[PDB]
Design an enzyme around this catalytic site. Structure first.
Site, mmCIF file in Angstrom:
data_model
loop_
_atom_site.group_PDB
_atom_site.id
_atom_site.type_symbol
_atom_site.label_atom_id
_atom_site.label_comp_id
_atom_site.label_asym_id
_atom_site.label_seq_id
_atom_site.Cartn_x
_atom_site.Cartn_y
_atom_site.Cartn_z
ATOM 1 N N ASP A 91 -2.125 21.688 -5.337
ATOM 2 C CA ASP A 91 -1.076 22.272 -4.450
ATOM 3 C C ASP A 91 0.146 22.708 -5.282
ATOM 4 O OD1 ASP A 91 -2.546 22.022 -2.067
ATOM 5 O OD2 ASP A 91 -1.138 20.644 -1.086
ATOM 6 N N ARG B 5 -3.288 32.831 -9.245
ATOM 7 C CA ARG B 5 -4.641 32.308 -9.593
ATOM 8 C C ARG B 5 -5.607 33.489 -9.815
ATOM 9 N NH1 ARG B 5 -4.834 27.649 -4.803
ATOM 10 N NH2 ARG B 5 -2.687 26.905 -5.186
ATOM 11 N N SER B 6 -5.554 34.506 -8.962
ATOM 12 C CA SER B 6 -6.402 35.722 -9.030
ATOM 13 C C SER B 6 -6.202 36.404 -10.395
ATOM 14 C CB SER B 6 -6.084 36.643 -7.866
ATOM 15 O OG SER B 6 -6.578 36.119 -6.624
ATOM 16 N N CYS C 235 -6.596 34.795 -3.825
ATOM 17 C CA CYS C 235 -5.950 33.492 -3.582
ATOM 18 C C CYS C 235 -5.110 33.685 -2.307
ATOM 19 C CB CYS C 235 -5.190 33.059 -4.824
ATOM 20 S SG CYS C 235 -4.191 34.401 -5.541
ATOM 21 N N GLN D 198 2.082 34.423 -11.944
ATOM 22 C CA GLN D 198 3.320 34.224 -11.118
ATOM 23 C C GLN D 198 4.330 33.294 -11.819
ATOM 24 O OE1 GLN D 198 1.293 33.235 -7.232
ATOM 25 N NE2 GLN D 198 2.889 34.513 -6.325
#
Ligand SMILES: C[C@H]1CN=C(Nc2ccc(F)cc2)S1
EC number: 3.1.3.48
Length: 284
Positions: free
Chosen positions: A181, A221-222, A215, A262
């Protein structure tokens, strides 16, 4: 400069934030006019994450051709990816329409439907064999065929049917279920194992359409997934594997979708994945 050495130099100096901001400063800026049209408001999960007009995926319908999705075309690596946001309540039918029209074999999902007590994506695949899904807006039917649940990822076999023509295709659903998370995994071992399973399926291969990767926003994450794949492919193909510059590959990819990677933690994790993955790609 060998990336393993560059890695220890950034780590020892603690300059990850400063490298990451140089990338943000140099990254391409292109218009996103179609994404910002008022008719497309409810087709976007986040107001600050839009596909560029030049690289966006278009739906094959005269009505409204818009989806929050981009084609990342890597010329030297000879790989294509579609990066998209987690489907929304009113775009679930658009998502499966894109999978059909682009002839994709695989869908890669890097998020859970609920994270941090909020909804990150819709439940857009059927959870039981005998309870199929119908998308009336795009005239498609989706059926769960089988499910293989492991410790770090689940693979599902799905059947997608074009109710207009009655053609059917097998789609593979690769679901990474253990990204935490907050922050990034401690070790890249299970992420690399996941990437090799997607590859082994033929989902990343030129006899199919591009793989669909998502994601929540389709950039974090992508981004990590397609940057690591492309970097390891380039280390296989070139006479000097140490010539592969991960910051240069990221800026090239950022010409096709904004915001890929990110955080400075995600950049560092990308280096670790490639450095570790190369200890297979260079003959082990
Ligand atoms: C019952 C399946 C066939 N048609 C569906 N539409 C839908 C889309 C998004 C969402 F979040 C909830 C429901 S789901």
């Amino acid at each position: 400069m060998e990336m393993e050495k560059e890695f220890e130099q950034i780590d020892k100096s603690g300059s990850w934030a400063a490298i990451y901001q140089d990338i943000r400063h140099e990254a391409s800026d292109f218009p996103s006019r179609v994404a910002k049209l008022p008719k497309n408001k409810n087709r976007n999960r986040y107001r600050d994450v839009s596909p560029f007009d030049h690289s966006r995926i278009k739906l094959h319908q005269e009505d409204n051709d818009y989806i929050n999705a981009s084609l990342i075309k890597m010329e030297e690596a000879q790989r294509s990816y579609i990066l998209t946001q987690g489907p929304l309540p009113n775009t679930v039918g658009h998502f499966w329409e894109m999978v059909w029209e682009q002839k994709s074999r695989g869908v890669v999902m890097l998020n859970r439907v609920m994270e941090k007590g909020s909804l990150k994506c819709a439940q857009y695949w059927p959870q039981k064999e005998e309870k199929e899904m119908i998308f009336e807006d795009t005239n498609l039917k989706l059926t769960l065929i089988s499910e293989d649940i492991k410790s770090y990822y689940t693979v599902r076999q799905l059947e997608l049917e074009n109710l207009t023509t009655q053609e059917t295709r097998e789609i593979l659903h690769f679901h990474y279920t253990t990204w935490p998370d907050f922050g990034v995994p401690e070790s890249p071992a299970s992420f690399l194992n996941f990437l090799f399973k997607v590859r082994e399926s033929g989902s990343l291969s030129p006899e199919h359409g591009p793989v669909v990767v998502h994601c929540s926003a389709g950039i974090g994450r992508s981004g990590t997934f397609c940057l690591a794949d492309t970097c390891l492919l380039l280390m296989d193909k070139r006479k000097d594997p140490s010539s592969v510059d991960i910051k240069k590959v990221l800026l090239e990819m950022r010409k096709f979708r904004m915001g890929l990677i990110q955080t400075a933690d995600q950049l560092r994790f990308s280096y670790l994945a490639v450095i570790e993955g190369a200890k297979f790609i260079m003959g082990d």
